[PDB]
């Protein structure tokens with residue numbers, strides 16, 4: 001069984017989900033469908049992943065076959081950077097709602113505390129790093145709170161059940177908590193033994209914000225920007241600390257990395273194209289790491305970040 | 320001799336100043352007076368330091384003697400944490416103007432991106448960590464931008480020439496730049512070889528924001544406060560890298576530590592607590608560090624932070 005986490009919004013969120021990043025458009029539907037059959041109920045998507053239409057197909061098929069009801073599926077989407085200007089927030093949320101073929105998303109997160117110049121959905125979707133002027137980055141002067149209030153209105157309109165943020169450092173999250181009416185229910189950040197950010201996790205959890213981790217396998221996880229940084233990093237799967245703990249419990253390094261977060265109340269969203277791993281990625285809660293295990297793993301924290309906007313255009317999010 | 324820096328506001332600011340933190344009230348006036356006779360023109364103060372009245376006495380004395388005119392002195396003050404609510408900003412500034420005995424302050428910075436619950440000036444001043452409920456910390460929901468607008472108003476009212484922020488991480492400064500009419504002219508942060516944050520510096524400077532470093536001597540300032548972290552840290556004055564470079568140019572480690580910041584366009588406000596130091600700390604621009612030198616000093620960066628709100632009450636400002 002996959003334990004649930006009660007968000008500050010009152011809604012329940014599965015502690016384990018299926019990452020949808022990089023899911024091929026041609027197979028995304030079938031894969032989400034199979035994941036549902038395998039037991040997954042939460043799917044972590046994003047407008048920027050360009051496959052929400054297909055993720056929706058998979059979900060619709062599971063429902064149409066009577067496998068699950070909409071009420072049983074937890075869908076997470078994220079507002080891309082070009083859509084921070086309040087007047088563009090609803091239009092972006094609608095495109096997401098249509099693509100997924102649903103009336104509301106369970107969780108809608110501000111993907112990045114970065115506001116790109118608006119680009120019409122018809123001109124290019126998803127825009128990625130395109131800002132309307134060739135390969136140049138162009139930003140909009142839209143404070144985070146403006147975008148957040150827009151999201152709050154959308155929750156009142158019944159189009160979103162819970163809202164949160166992603167890739168938000170501590171100072172920024174704090175300032176948002178000051179002007180927010182609906183408190184961020186979730187903070188989704190890169191989280192693994194090489195980037196533990198223990199103080200950020202503790203602050204958030206105490207503030208009642210739930211943590212959703214991504215790139216749980218560190219460099220073993222998928223890395224698109226500065227692939228070199230990840231390739232030149234000693235894998236966690238082969239790290240002696242992880243290897244020893246894994247051997248000790250007769251578990252795979254992957255199970256140890258996912259449990260390391262789960263046992264600490266952090267939600268995970270692994271992604272696998274292999275059916276065997278798919279099942280393992282949701283069946284790892286069969287053991288508990290000890291105090292010593294946690295101490296040994298804690299020594300790995302070196303602040304190594306693989307998803308950094310500083311690589312995009314020297315955006316100071318993490319400095 | 321002391322180079323000026325033209326701020327984004329159009330006003331000049333001495334690149335070398337006199338720090339007023341932990342400047343005893345009993346002799347603050349005399350010391351400020353002496354600093355002025357020694358050539359200092361910028362004084363970095365703060366409501367929290369609780370010595371602005373004395374600082375004011377020293378400036379007034381120098382003025383009454385005809386040593387300087389108000390316009391030649393550059394006075395920096397900082398809005399303490401209990402006064403972030405817009406309705407209390409001008410109140411706090413008036414207290415500063417009344418103690419300094421001036422019509423305006425040259426620079427007024429948001430001391431910290433932290434908002435303590437308001438405490439009437441008549442109940443306790445300065446409040447320090449007092450938040451109106453015993454030894455408990457209490458906060459108020461006041462977004463940074465709200466405080467910034469109150470300040471922008473005061474600039475238009477002629478009470479402040481330039482405004483800026485202190486202890487702001489990159490993400491927070493970026494967001495502020497999104498909603499600010501008057502761009503923060505200054506970013507004052509802890510800056511020394513053990514905490515270089517080169518990316519924050521680069522971003523700020525490229526954004527036209529002027530950097531003022533504080534605690535240029537690392538742990539020294541905090542050792543004098545009996546802080547465990549600083550006491551356990553090897554001093555920069557006795558560090559092999561600093562001494563080697565100092566010897567190379569026949570300069571003192573102190574001079575190398577200040578030049579290291581000054582050469583990269585960073586303003587310094589060293590705490591001179593001895594006559595000899597008054598002179599030393601304003602006459603270091605007598606040599607240039609080479610690329611090799613910077614690369615050597617660069618190796619000391621280990622992210623060691625001495626002034627951290629996380630120590631007060633786990634405030635996630637730098638996490």
Ligand SMILES: NC(=O)c1ccc[n+]([C@@H]2O[C@H](COP(=O)([O-])OP(=O)(O)OC[C@H]3O[C@@H](n4cnc5c(N)ncnc54)[C@H](OP(=O)(O)O)[C@@H]3O)[C@@H](O)[C@H]2O)c1
Nearest residue numbers: 019020021044166214215220221222254270271272273277
């Ligand atoms: N908000 C954000 O900024 C952000 C950023 C990145 C990701 N995310 C989200 O979080 C999810 C996690 O990121 P991710 O997909 O890169 O990482 P991941 O789900 O941890 O998977 C990364 C890699 O590990 C392999 N893998 C998966 N399960 C495994 C297992 N049990 N044993 C061994 N290898 C295994 C996969 O290969 P195979 O598929 O071949 O098995 C894949 O190459 C994403 O799908 C996305 O939804 C959010």
Ligand SMILES: NC(=O)c1ccc[n+]([C@@H]2O[C@H](COP(=O)([O-])OP(=O)(O)OC[C@H]3O[C@@H](n4cnc5c(N)ncnc54)[C@H](O)[C@@H]3O)[C@@H](O)[C@H]2O)c1
Nearest residue numbers: 338339340363485533534535536539540573588589590596
């Ligand atoms: N905004 C903020 O959060 C913040 C925090 C701390 C300090 N500040 C400001 O910046 C100033 C400088 O920082 P600081 O006071 O913490 O430390 P500093 O690095 O300026 O000096 C610290 C100590 O080192 C010694 N020192 C000074 N000059 C020396 C020399 N030539 N040779 C040998 N030792 C020397 C003195 O004993 C002094 O107390 C403060 O006075 C204050 O105005 C601002």
